[model samples]
Target: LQEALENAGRLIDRQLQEDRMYPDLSELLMVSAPNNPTVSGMSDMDYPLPEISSIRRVPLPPELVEQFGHNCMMGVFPPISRAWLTIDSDIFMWNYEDGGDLAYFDGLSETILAVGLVKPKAGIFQPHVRHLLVLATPVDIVILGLLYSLPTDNTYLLTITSTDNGRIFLAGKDGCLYEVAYCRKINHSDDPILQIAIDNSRNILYTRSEKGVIQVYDLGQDGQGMSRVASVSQNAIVSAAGNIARTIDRSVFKPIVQIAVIENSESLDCQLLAVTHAGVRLYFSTCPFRQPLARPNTLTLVHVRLPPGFSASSTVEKPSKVHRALYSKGILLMAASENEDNDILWCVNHDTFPFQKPMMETQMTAGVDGHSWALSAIKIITPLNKDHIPITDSPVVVQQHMLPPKKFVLLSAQGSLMFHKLRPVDQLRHLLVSNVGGDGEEIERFFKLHQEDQACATCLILACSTDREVSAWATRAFFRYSGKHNGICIYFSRIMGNIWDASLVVERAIESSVPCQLLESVLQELKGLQEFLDRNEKISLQAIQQLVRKSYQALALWKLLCEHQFTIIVAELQKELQEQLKITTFKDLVIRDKELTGALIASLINCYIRDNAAVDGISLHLQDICPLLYSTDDAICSKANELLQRSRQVQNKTEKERMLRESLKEYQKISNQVDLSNVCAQYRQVRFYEGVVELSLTAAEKKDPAFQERLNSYKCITDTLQE
Candidate 1:
């Protein structure tokens, strides 16, 4: 009784600690659900579920609470390899490898003002921890090892970290951090710089401040120094907003929350973007700031006001607060929080929007279940290559093989952490829910853009769609795509079974023009289709005939690819002999050649064995199979080689007979067979009555013709021996 009470007390103690609890996206789903399902529209319409990755939780320590009831701030800097959370004066860092906590810095003298990450040096593929930059106070900018403070009268608001030279740009009330040449200060408005963005490709820097002031600097080679080339103010934006929202009292000015620079094309003017706070207006410049404050840059502001029926805005009397915004690849994303604590995510397609005028696309809104914690931060990140992030300096080309695509991470006040991906799929799902039929042109362009990256993912979601129209659309695209991308051609024959016109597909494939590459791919596809058909027992006579004809075509393909493949392999061996193939000795070269030959032959034989239409033909070709059998190193081939070697080992009668019997048993396990009549007679003549009896019984149970006669004869011999 006492032990039970103690155990219960210990469990409760663990639950009470914030650091001991880890929850995920499903946890948010459960809490956000209404008690009555029908009230929440659970059955009214089946919602389109976005493909979201598992949400990871990062729990905070109780002692690091925000000061005087202030919310915590979180930031993800993918370029410097960390996600940081600031609680009062303390900050915690996290990595993607394992656990939530990567490093925690608690004994800080000042609160974190802002954080930034240095871009990776050119030719460098991954971000390192040494590039971490944190603004500790208005007085200091910090690197990981220690602090760097300069005695200046300037009050620092934000700083930008640079690549290679570690030359950081600082924006403040006056003179601030700059390059290797000297400390350069800008002559601008008295209002401090609130936001900064850099165009690394063109070596340009942009800054915006509290009173809606802007500055642009064309940086020098390697960003050694910079000179101010242009500047602008909020007057143009105010005019643009008033032109769009004419009735809304043009006098009230909104503060800008974020700025992202767009790299200039090979044209006379450059471009940039900004988002204002309250009413969520997106402002984009039609011309360079360099045309100057001397002439108008023609800024255009588009209102992103949420609909009145939005669930997040239902209880609010005013507009939602735009918390964070990101502009990448001309796609503008905004995360806004409303009075009810629900966050509304908005994505604007820049490709479709008019750059010169104030026009808006349909506002896309998605609800991120934050459970109870209000979201404090959001970041769009493309993670560094996972396996390539090590101490060794491998070539970037080798490291570039398999990096994951872009995703966005969200963080809340109480340390609730999660990430979301699947942009292409979610948008298509939205189109379906909104009653728009398949956008065939756009879907094809998506396939054209992502031939290797997200192409398969697009096919999977469409194929799995409950709408037959979408599924059929997916099949048409799948066949069209399979013709060019051999990477996905492996699924060609396998997916035919899903369609009602499966026979038509098989007929077309057989009649199609034959390339050795295409036929090899077909052989691979046929292996899976044959296995699937054998398991289901639903194969038609036409399908069986299709497989037989395809197998013969593949046999011809084997002859061609066998020689072509050997030439390619040998060429590779000769070129990479010292560097990659590890061929230092003659024996190594000989062994390599033999292994290559073995693999060449095994490829065809294994395909034949897996093809249902060709096994009977293989039985007649066993002699041909054995000619290359001893040289190969496959599982079935290796086992067959072992028994054949033993067949010539010893001449002692009893020992030979016994091992021969055991060898037969070994073959039975891996290979299903015939040629049993001679083996049965051989076993009985050797007086191994027990072996003969079991063998005959197994053969008879399988219901082979003549097996019953063999079994009765064996039983008669055994019965006579017993008497």
Candidate 2:
């Protein structure tokens, strides 16, 4: 009771933060010291651990400990089961760096952890660990016992895993492939195993020896484990480069750095991307793993070079060592060492890999310097839940509204771990820039699977890449799913110049009451065309044609905007007058529409008379509408048409002067005086100085210091009219 009161006092001091509400009485709750103090399974000032967060320290379930003795008594095979059930007999950890805890998803709900435990009871020279395949559940742990222990002898240093969670390929220091599941061995080489990658989809395994010999093994017929298919020496790969490649130092043997499994199932052919040490030569090979069938392993070598912008220094030492590489969708992410403090993390498109330049590169470690954080392991994995089930199936994309992104688990040299997902831009590049969406069906299916935001972003990205049809479809899908007004403008802006036909978006945008957004996008398109025409010497015929189409689209949008804005003004005025006097008609209120419609008409007039190719086309198009609609205000309507006509055909100087004065008188009725500046600038460009004087004087009559300056500027042009 006194100790309980003391604990309560301590809890009160900590503001009741501790969960000391219940006191344990059973001896079963006793805590024990760690089995191995030297190997804490975490990086310390001592020898830094390499596996780090690649392998997790799995917590043994409390139910397993509680029922251990009862199970031991009830079991027939007690000896082996007792040894396996002992909690503290052996220190458990992952065997190698990349192999990790061999966490795998069954495509079902189960997440199986295949880990290895180090036996200190064995001699120090025997560095082998006992492998344990476990089926972990939320409630309890069930051990899927295996008889075979790894390394069989002390010669093997590391273990390599396979596509299946239960099955694994053990490559030893003795240069042999150990199919641990079937207890089969395939003799490979005399040298130690350097790196390995397995492509289970193609049923092939690529293993590179320390002597730079890469061998291919094919899955045997029926129950047969595996058979040696082919082997290639690094020398042959280097020699395959003919006379142009004679400058290479053939004397210094470049070892195999890493091999990545490119699982793009374009065909049955197994593709492998391998990097060699110093003067990093990338060897890409395509061959059918099934033996004696069609073609031999064809190797293509590409000499790697750093991107020009990466090293601006005159004498920057180019990194030649390719440490780690991984291929996802169509992007190849690599980590290489540049300086002691900077480890270059490179992501390049697979198609552009031959160019040897990274699409994106950044230092792996952000704050810390003075030591390169060489990435020891990079595994593309999905986030898991309590049931050990993956949150998402495919690594294609991860957005807030979509399935979780494929998390990139990176383990550095100092045993530091990091979790990163592809950024939004990276996801976009993966979708459009890569060959994953080369087919219309794939792009369509992906759109169907994701939300509107991803589809919208995909449309904009595809539009920029100049894929007109796909972007059009993507834009349609985005609108179908999400009819957001803001997204409509941004999407149309991307599609305007790039897409051959933007009528679909424009018509749909107008129908959806987004004519304002359409007008803004059309104005943006016009500005872009003007920028392109700024360099007329180098302009193409296609660009000139695009200018015509865009001009027509912008004019159509402006006409739509004029109608929509006038409709809004009519509605707004009717609502106001109805609240004051119910008998007031819209025709009577139309005269009072000067306040709102002024700015709208001013902007519309400016677009109609602006010094663009659209002006002539707009004048011709507006001339088709001869009869003014009696339902709306005929004043601004007739005035707008007259201004467009004068802009196109006002040749006589006196007539042009009178036209500008009338237009400026109407433009001066706008509430926002800011609209007249561009209007004045346009008139001055056309040498209509008399109209500029009239427009500037009207603006200067009411609250106009800026307009007074404009009047002073036009005074020079009017004074020079005598010439």
Candidate 3:
């Protein structure tokens, strides 16, 4: 031991001397837990569960999965803006305008009605915030359109075209080819297609010949004069329409039900992807203009398999049936495979292109069961990685079990639906599982992999139906794979219903602070819900009421903080919790009469010691004031809680100060030190405090009147205080 200490003898002597002089009395200096102290006595949850961050499902009891919809929809649809497509924004799916619909999915009402069809609007995301072009039906109200955005803003610039007659045609109630930027505004009265389009005169650039064919044209920058780029050929990149059945026109055009753009190559190689009544095609041009190897090359691909009955092989002499195809970032391809019994999603990879393998060979479903019922208009959520090896993303697949006249318009630029029966959710925990066992488990590795690529961790599935069965089924799988997870606000609100059902995710919000802003409408709904709760026959109201009280208290806390009336905020909080605002402040209420009193006092003391907390005229309200005040009850650390409560227990005015000095020191050592940065030297530099220096300085400035008399006098006092 003596020999071990020899190398650092001088520094050890200095540290020992410093400790002796200061007398390191904090108990934290002696003991600490290496794991989450809240879980110190507990083992891994025997049943295991999913976290929002989890990429796989934990096994679930059959009864639990059975309680939800199996091979059914989540519920009635939230009022969708035929104009809206993305679900990641969270807010907009529940958002709506409301005029024609009879069905209503009330997010806050106490009604116990079963699955419904149309939910009203809730704005978790602003649909209008992104850039896009919406294709409208002839009635101008059918609500058909394209949704997109701009990073630097390229072609969300041109009017999309179809290889056809000289003019742009009708399909909306019709539908594609070509794609745009802006002009003097296409139709200002309309929302999304608003500013960027040149007003009327028709933003339509090229038209299909009702035969599902269109020639490409260059509508020179922002609706200027146009010139033809590519004309329709006997062999071209066009939809394989069977005949007049698809399009409603008196004309016989078997319409291209859906279309999309392949992710452009780094060279902007310009490949146009479209699916027709007959098949899927890739049209490549060197550029969108004057030339690329003289003319665009159309590659009619047979490498993808579509919905089973829709055969491309028997009559492959022409084209086959393909619902949709997307570039899912990983350089992988996802094509819709809607069969009568199962709504399957299949991925096509590098091995099958420009060559063979799974294409005309053996096709396998991504993970779907052979039974059930369903479909896509695939939705892209949290799309990823321009910088991955092969760069791919898993798109959301909507399984729908409906009739012939069904269609889902997506920003994927394509969609078709399907449904399947259920099975062991864990065995098939993910929508796309890389492997079953944990060698490097599929979900686990994907979770870490996405983290490495910095991608969205969850893959979402929205069922295309009115039946909650399929939706409930998918959610059963989703929740099986995920847990209480990321972003916006706290996720689990058993009180408010799992947000947007199980399709979307709720963020684990830190409860200590209120939202940056809450609209009066939200406040009003909280009130209305309370009123309804008073009359409802659901669960007990005690916990719910307790939850309600703290919510208001939180709102009250914010108001008080904003008013900067620290004292009032404390008194108000004390008023809110006579008891069990617990997570709101269990240990605090245990020691003092209220939260803001001793807790606030301790916070202010902490702030003053940090020194940077003020002097800019504003002081920080300490985050440490009630660090875990709103954290889960069971999660409170016992040893930390006890010592903390002990510090607040001493009652005498002078003793309270002593208790705090001791407690803060102890907490920094034992409780907070587990956080790596807490003990960091550089971290302490900005946060450092030499209380003796503060004591010396304050006395000079305050006790001596000369310190406040003038700048020169204050400087003299300041200089003397430092010495």
lDDT leader: 1
Ranking by lDDT: 1, 2, 3
Report RMSD for candidate 2: 27.0
lDDT of 1 by residue, 212-269 (tens): 7666665654564466766667776666555654544444446677676654431113
Off by over 4 Å in 2: 1-154, 183-189, 220-225, 242-253, 266-270, 278-281, 288-317, 337-344, 349-404, 413-415, 425-723
Which candidate, 2 or 3, has the higher TM-score?
Answer: 2
Give the Å error, residue 274, model 2.
Answer: 1.2
* Overall lDDT per candidate, in order of appearance: 0.42, 0.39, 0.27
For residues 162-239, what per-residue lDDT tens digits would candidate 3 score against the true structure? 212222222221122222222112221111110011111212233333344444445443444455555453233322
Number of colliding residue pairs in model 2: 0
Alpha-carbon TM-score of each model against the true structure: 0.45, 0.36, 0.29
Q: Could you list the CA RMSD of all candidates, in the order they appear?
A: 20.1, 27.0, 22.4
Q: Model 1 scores what on Cα lDDT?
A: 0.42
TM-score rank, highest first? 1, 2, 3
lDDT of 3: 0.27
Per model, state how many residue pairs clash: 0, 0, 81
